[PDB]
Structures are given as C-alpha cells and as structure tokens.
Write a protein that binds this ligand. Structure first.
Ligand SMILES: O=C(N[C@H](Cc1cccc(F)c1)C(=O)O)c1ccc2ccccc2c1
Length: 113
C-alpha cells in the first residue's frame, strides 16, 4: 500500500448529514434515500459513458472540492473519515468506488494516484 493516495470524489449530502449545507444549496433538503438515488444515477451515467466523473463533480458535488473538479489531493491514513479512507485505499488507480457512506453524506470516489 502506498503511503498516500490521490482521489477525486463527488459528495451528495442529505438533510441528516453532519453539515447539511453546501456551496450548492443554503440548506440540504433531500432525503437520505434521494441522495443514494442520485449517487446511483451518477454511477450509472459514468458507467454508460454519458457523463465524465470530474465534470459531474465540478458542478454537482456538495463538497467545496467541486472547485477543483472533485480533487482532494493526496492523503494518508488517519486523516479522512474512516469509511472514506478505507474505500480510497482499496481502489486501484483509475478505479471508481460504489456508494461510500460517511457522516458528511454519500460519496463516489475516483482514485487518480
Ligand atoms: O434537479 C436537479 N439537480 C438536483 C437539485 C439541485 C440541488 C442543488 C443545486 C441545484 F441547482 C439543483 C441535484 O443536483 O441534486 C437538476 C435539474 C435540471 C438539470 C438539468 C441539466 C443537468 C442537471 C440538472 C439537475
């Protein structure tokens, strides 16, 4: 395992997220159920080729990393929330995760390095 990985992600928050606000919306109103529906629909569009991961993250991620087209930069273990970390380190470079759940919301992760 490398000391650090670089990943991009797309976060979809919901009304029970730790911080249910984002640069996209003053208050996150969608339900947890709707957030997972959106995540799964993004996964399906990326798998079909209809959408590009980082292009989608740049406009639809609730994380401020949307400004960097979803890029979080490099990180080691012990930094990110544990479910995010474990998913990220389990990816090969070029691989995308399925839904990943944290206190922040629901993510899809693309490992880039
Ligand atoms: O409903 C849409 N987006 C939803 C609702 C929403 C949430 C936060 C910001 C916003 F502009 C829209 C979402 O992103 O979760 C929506 C509506 C029309 C669109 C048209 C083209 C592409 C994406 C589009 C997306």
């Amino acid at each position: 395992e490398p000391a650090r990985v670089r990943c991009s992600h797309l976060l979809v928050k919901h009304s029970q997220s730790r911080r249910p606000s984002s640069w996209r919306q003053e208050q996150i109103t969608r339900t947890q159920e709707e957030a997972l529906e959106l995540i799964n629909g993004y996964i399906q569009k990326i798998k079909s080729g209809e959408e590009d991961f980082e292009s989608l993250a740049s406009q639809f991620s609730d994380c401020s990393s949307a400004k960097a087209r979803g890029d979080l930069g490099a990180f080691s273990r012990g930094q990110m929330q544990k479910p995010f970390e474990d998913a990220s380190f389990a990816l090969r470079t070029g691989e995308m995760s399925g839904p990943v759940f944290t206190d922040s919301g629901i993510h899809i992760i693309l490992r880039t390095e």
